[PDB]
Amino acid sequence: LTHQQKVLRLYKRALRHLESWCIHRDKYRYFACLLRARFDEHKNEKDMVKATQLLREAEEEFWHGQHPQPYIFPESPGGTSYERYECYKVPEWCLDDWHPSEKAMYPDYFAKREQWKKLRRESWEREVKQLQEETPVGGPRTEALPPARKQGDLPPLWWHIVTRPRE
Amino acid sequence: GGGAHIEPRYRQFPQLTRSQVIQAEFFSATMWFWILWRFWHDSDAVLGHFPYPDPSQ
Amino acid sequence: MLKYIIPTIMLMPLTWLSKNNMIWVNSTAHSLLISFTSLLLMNQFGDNSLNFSLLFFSDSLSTPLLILTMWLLPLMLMASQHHLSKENLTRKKLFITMLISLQLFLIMTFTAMELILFYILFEATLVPTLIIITRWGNQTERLNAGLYFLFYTLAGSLPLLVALIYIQNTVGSLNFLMLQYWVQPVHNSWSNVFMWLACMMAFMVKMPLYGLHLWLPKAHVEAPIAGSMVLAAVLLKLGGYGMLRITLILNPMTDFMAYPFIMLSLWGMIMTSSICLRQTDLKSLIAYSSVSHMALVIVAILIQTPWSYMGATALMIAHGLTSSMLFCLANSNYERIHSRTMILARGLQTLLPLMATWWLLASLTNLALPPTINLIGELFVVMSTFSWSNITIILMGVNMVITALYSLYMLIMTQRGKYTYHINNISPSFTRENALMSLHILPLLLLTLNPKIILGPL
Amino acid sequence: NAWALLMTLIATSFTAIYSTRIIFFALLGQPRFPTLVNINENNPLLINSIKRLLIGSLFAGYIISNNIPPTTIPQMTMPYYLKTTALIVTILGFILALEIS
Amino acid sequence: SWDKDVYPEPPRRTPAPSPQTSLPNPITYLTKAFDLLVDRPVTLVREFIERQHAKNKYYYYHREFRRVPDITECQEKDVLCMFEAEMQWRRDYKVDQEIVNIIQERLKACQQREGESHRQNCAKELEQFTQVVKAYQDRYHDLGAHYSARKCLAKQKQRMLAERKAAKEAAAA
Amino acid sequence: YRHSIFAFTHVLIPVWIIHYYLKYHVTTKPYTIVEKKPRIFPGDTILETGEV
Amino acid sequence: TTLDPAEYDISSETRKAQAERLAIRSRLKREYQLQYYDPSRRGVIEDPALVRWTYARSANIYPNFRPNTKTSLLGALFGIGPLVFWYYVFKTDRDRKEKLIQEGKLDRTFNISY
Amino acid sequence: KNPDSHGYDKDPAVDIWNMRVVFFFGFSIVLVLGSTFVAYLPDYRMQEWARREAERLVKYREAHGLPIMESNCFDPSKIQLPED
Amino acid sequence: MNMFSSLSLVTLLLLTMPIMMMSFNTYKPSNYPLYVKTAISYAFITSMIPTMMFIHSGQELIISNWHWLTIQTLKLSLSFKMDYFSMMFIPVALFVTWSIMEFSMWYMYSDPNINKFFKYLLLFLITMLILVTANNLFQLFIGWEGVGIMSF
Amino acid sequence: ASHITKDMLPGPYPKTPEERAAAAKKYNMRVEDYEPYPDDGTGYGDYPKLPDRSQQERDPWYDWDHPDLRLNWGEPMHWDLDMYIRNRVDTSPTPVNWNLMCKHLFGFVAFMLFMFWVGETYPAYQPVGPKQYPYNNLYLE
Amino acid sequence: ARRYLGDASVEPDPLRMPTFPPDYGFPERKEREMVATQQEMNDAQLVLQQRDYCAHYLIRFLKCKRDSFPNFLACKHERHDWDYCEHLDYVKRMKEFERERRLLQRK
Amino acid sequence: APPLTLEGIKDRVLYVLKLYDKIDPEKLSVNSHFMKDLGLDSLDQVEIIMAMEDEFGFEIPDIDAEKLMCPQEIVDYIADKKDVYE
Fold first, then answer.
1. Is the bond preceding residue A154 a cis peptide, omega within 30 degrees?
2. In terms of C-beta density within 10 A (0-12 exposed, 13-18 middle, 19 or more buried), how is residue C100 classed?
3. Which of C99, E7, E28, J51 could hold F30 in an S-S bridge, CB 3.0 to 4.6 Å?
């Protein structure tokens, strides 16, 4: 994480644990600027050790004053009924084993599927081999050229592009 | 889809059905009427009073 | 009797004599039929036990135990079919022959009329089993399972034949169990311990104590295709019952030294089930169940005083099925995904919905819900072994805890989301997957209706 | 034990603040929650359910109790200050409920 | 039914009615109702077969054995003569289990028959019951040899201790 | 409306079957259902006599 | 209690020369997805970290073992130890309970079972 | 093993034969036809015989003079009882 | 008094009918819940009857029915208990559960597996109902753990 | 069918740079402090060279943590170190190492002495000496 | 516990009462306080600690209870007077901390 | 089941952003590029997502902050989270 944005991850959560402490909707709102005052007290000064005491002593006075059972935003990294619905989870590619007379239904939809595959049937010869041209040796984060220079098909097809919905 | 039968609220405070609350309020009596017979007739304690057993003779 | 050995040996050229692929269905068809004969004259007494010939009383004994032995045969060819279809027919004719060649002795044994037909037929296996382990293994560690499976089983079962030939010429004739009507006791010496110790330790090395089980997971982890003989080797083991024919008599009155077999297996029962929790290989995970609530019988048998035999018999055939059937699940789920590593298979229960209730009813009968045989086979253990000394309630009371975390962790590992990379696992359990997995839970729970047919004489 | 008397009756107090807390944050303060709230309580398959209990609630305690063969002897002579000593606590529970709310 | 003196029970003592009151009783609108939706589909069918069953009468007899074999004969090492001397003893240990069953259920009929007193009545079963089982495990119970049941070899060798100790070594007797 | 035999196929099949297993039964078992005593009160052969 | 678990520590700026700790992993997730996206596969992936997860755990110890350090002769404090204890507990009972069964009668006479 | 055949065991035909040869032989002729056998199968371990005969014989003694559940050691003075 | 016990078991045998008739009874379609929800309604009024029969004459009952295995001496068969905790409570535990499923009937209304929800809510009531009624101490333990699995 | 050098061999020092990473990269540079070192207290055959241990503890934490998957679901290619206790363990709580529970669990232990007394309501304490008399003291009639 | 002599019949759960069980009794008031007939006491179904005083009185209470079955009230004065039998008894038994208080003090 | 469309999200986001008196409601809505209304480095980007959480209310992931340059970009992927427009 670049030294510049390191306060954000605190600046995101700072007021976050606040609101679960306050009760009235104004209480959060009334202390906004008042506790907002402390940030820009020294607004423009050194990036290094001079202002690192804005990072250094931020540790205490935060962890101190922490865990009033925060509001968890139910569907999220934690807290109730977040990951709740798995009874569907949309197992994409359920379309393999059928024994038709189970395939009579959704004929228009079976027509559409086999039309998607043609892209993934052969998109490769320039899709894969360009990744042999694109990343010279040890390349970091691995996405292709954002267009793939003419038509990406998908290119990330279809696992990320067709992936499973929520209901 | 299913139907429009009620639209949601932008915090315009949605309206009631007008048979929703009255049909309920008749069950605000059943606590306030059935509380009638508490003090009538029963007191804070219906007991009889222990008369300090003075006859140690 | 010959009602049985003769058709089941008549099976033997029902197979090769046939044509091409008709072979499997040919013998599976008949092999079921014999089960009518199995019950047929059996389940007579009852009181004053059945002996119909000089050297055979098939099973009277109230150790019926033989009906199962005739089940598991035409459960194999439904079980064993998967990857054995990939080599030649004259070899496939073999693997059905030796597999029968086992089934013929397990009818001979459990009857035996005596001690000395038991032994030579007690050691008469290991010719057919050893050949199924070494060939048709999977890994290359199999070659050592070949040895370890001997050099124990045979290692100390020779001291039988030194002892049983010592009795034959000492008191009368051992020719018959049904005459013990003269038996003198065994008081004490530095000779008689050995006698009692020679007439015993050969049996322990089969149903493991917490020592000298070092072979049991070595052979099961790596072992034939379907569990094809792994279902059979979960019959073989429990068949160490014969300790029920001896220790009832034939040195009755030494309990003096029992204690090193009590406190040694009684603290292992709380033990080896607990070394089963972190296992990363599934056919290992079940192999250590098989020690645990099997090794509880060894504290049921040594103690006298029935209400143990009420409960010790129900156990030999209790896990006789449940512990069988689990090796049948972990086989199937392995057909599709070729690692036996437990982690790898996750995110099932969406993709094979009907096989959900199959895991459950299996893993529920280690929990031993009260009504089934399992508890009514455990709660005659605890009732007598409590009277032994009150403190047994603790350890074997702990067994009833760690075993519950034990089982679930195996199911609940297969409830998760995993789509993950598998393009395999399409087959939605074609009937044999769910057919052979049945014919266990149907017959198992069923017996609880009239469960006087599984009991000892006491 | 001359402790439970201390101990239990104190628990009777919190029986007020149990209630009044989840009453006063849910049923009392200003509306606070994101917009687009669709609430509809007109629900034949619900209102049918509550109505039975609360009716079968109020009358219940007296019907069940009134009909029994009596199985024991309660003391029935209860002196002062032993009497409403539960109610005596709840009275200030509600006090300390709202004052503290 | 059964044998009366095998399963005795005290008589009925039907309770007297006490209407006393001007108010309707609903049971009389049920016992007068329920009876009429029961008897017709029920009692007619039991009468239906029980005559339908008059067409044939089978038999199964009352099986009683032949007791010559005695007890403590015969010459020690023997097989034939001591094969049977258990068949006397084994059946007569299957009996003495059940005679504890019958006498036990008779006890239950001392309770829920009454159950309010549970104490000042019955006069018999409990004060008898623990005079029964104390006549059980002694000499009729081979323990801890009960696993082998040790028939007739240990059966007497409690009862040698019940001879070679009692009545003589009792000092002085 | 009827929909009058659905409640009949529901309850009236068992009520028959269950009692046919009782009327033919209670006197079969030597000691079956254990029903308790009448708990007689001094309304039959007795005077009170108090009231005291 | 278990544990701090050090959600802040020293940093900044030293060990900013440490990079390509991601190049180690970024290579694979490129190659892994280069593996994982293909039209025709239908099968599981090697995933060596799992092969070296069990096989360096179950097997490959008694080969690696040496019976030397007396922290590997520790187990006598573990394996045999309590197994003697359970003998000490029992053998006192089954006797203390036995002596009374002879002189004096603890039980009642309505105990037939056992 | 799905060229959109349905299939159970192996191939086109006797697979279809191979299902009826397990299902039908396997159960409905054994798990049912057989299970019937032991259901009402005759008196097991001679207990049925015992209830009545351990019933009749109770009152016989109770009727005239005799006690109940003797345990008299099977007629002593049939035994010489070695002392020492 | 002859109808006294016999009506209790009605409450008991009934709730098993919602299970047996799940496998080729020619099942009622969705609104299969209603098939059960009415199968409840008549059970409560069924249990309401014997409540009054007791609060007149007393006279609690048990039943001797069916001999499970009989070992050495103690003979365990099965039974039921009509006792004072049986007469009052059981009507209550059914009376609430009479009202409870309707709520779920609205709450779970959109779940495609609803049909077998009411099954794993049904056994729960069944076997929790045999705990209160059993006088045979073992029999108390059948439903003791029968419920302890239902939680899972 | 991985051919040669499947797993750990006789460490834990066989040219530490030869292992991580020949294959099985626990460390990048052969010093990440992930070098196949952690054979702490050897002679126990346990955990030989092992492109492996003492890498830190208390959980994979299972949160956003979303390069791709990164923790317990989605299986990043190869980090695996030790596991199997990781599905029943998490991280730092708010307080630290305060046993006030043994305090409170013994908080009532103060009232053990409150057990040795009784609670008899009638009459009051009324400091006494020889007035106690639970049943009787002096003559009957 | 007045007469401490033996029991002809041994039936405990005191089916052998001293004569009738009191709470304590007598000692003087009342020397013989008198209860009800035992032959009818356990002839009906009467729980323990229903054998205390006011047995004669409470046996009538249930008499009318069984009379009007479809009714929620029989006698609220008797149940009131059931204290007037019991309250009068219990208060008469509140006197045992009065005597022992001043009797066991100085003299 | 609650109907969701792509209009309101262009409105709601336009709405409260037009509610703040710190922004004149003549200013661009769908595309301002937000770097003209980024002032300063902080107290904008994380400042603006403080309110927008108060209506929908899912988590507003961290690494999605740098997508917030384009005012059409914020509304862009909120369609992909809650399963929004076709």
1. yes
2. buried
3. E7
C422 with C337: CB under 8 angstroms? yes
SS3 sequence of chain F = CCCCCHHHHHHHHHHHHHHHCCCCCCCCCCCCCCCCCCCCCCCCCCCCCCCC
- Cβ A127 vs Cβ A145: under 8 Å: no
Which of E21, E31, E32 is best to mutate for the I interface (most I CBs within 10 A)? E31
D87 Cα distance to chain centroid: 12
DSSP state, residue K85: H
Place of tokens 């995970």: C285
Give me the resolution in angstroms, 1 decimal: 5.0
Residues of E in CB contact (< 8 Å) with H are 3, 5-6, 62-64, 71-72, 94-99, 101-103, 132, 135-136, 138-140, 156, 159-160, 162-164, 168
3-state secondary structure of K94: coil
Which chains pack against G, by 3+ Cβ pairs within 8 A? A, C, E, I, J
Contacts of L56 in chain D (CB under 8 A): 34
Closest CA relative to residue I67, chosen from I59, I57, I77, I54 = I77
CA distance G46 to chain J (A): 9
Contact F51 K60 (CB under 8 A): yes
Alpha carbon of I20 to those of C370, C449, I27, I129, K5: distances in Å? 22, 17, 10, 18, 66
The answer to whether I34 and I2 are in contact (CB under 8 A) is no
First and final CA of chain C: distance in angstroms?
Answer: 25
- Residue written as tokens 């107090």? D13
CA nearest J92: which of C145, G5, A37?
Answer: G5
DSSP classification of residue C439: T
Q: Show residues of chain F in contact with K82, CB under 8 Å.
A: none
Q: CA-CA distance, G95 to G56, in Å (whole number)?
A: 49
Phi, psi of G55 (to 5 degrees): -70, -20
3-class secondary structure, B9? strand
Query: Which residue in J73, J74, J84 is closest to C278 by CB distance?
Result: J84
Integer Cα distance of H19 and K22 in angstroms: 82
Residues of A in contact with G20 (CB under 8 A): 138
Alpha carbon of residue C137 to chain centroid:
20
Which of C252, C275, C433, C419 shows the shortest CA–CA distance to C359? C433
The span from the CA of A91 to the CA of C420, in Å, is 10
CB G21 within 8 A of CB J32: yes
CB neighbours of residue C357 within 10 Å: 11
| Residues β-bridged to residue B9 | D37
Please give the full DSSP string across chain L, using - where no structure is assigned: -----SHHHHHHHHHHHHH-TTS-TTS-SS---SSTT--SSSSSHHHHHHHHTTTT-S---STTGGGGGSHHHHHHHHHHHTT---
d(CA C42, CA C55): 17
Asked if residue K89 lies in contact with residue B47, where contact means CB atoms within 8 angstroms, the answer is: no
Name the helix (H) or strand (E) containing D86. Answer: helix D85-100
The DSSP string of C88-156 is: -HHHHHHHHHHHHHHHHHHHHTTT-SSSHHHHHHHSS-SSHHHHHHHTT-SSSTHHHHHHHHTTTTTTT
Chain L within 8 Å of J63 (Cβ-Cβ)? no
D3 and chain J: CB distance < 8 Å anywhere?
A: yes
Gaps (C–N > 2.5 Å) in chain H: which residues precede them? none
Query: Cα–Cα distance between H17 and H4 in angstroms, integer?
Result: 19
Experimentally determined by: cryo-EM
| Sign of the torsion formed by the C-alpha atoms of C25, C27, C33 and C38 | negative
Structure tokens at H72: 């008299």
Q: Give the C-alpha separation, A24 to A32, whole Å.
A: 13
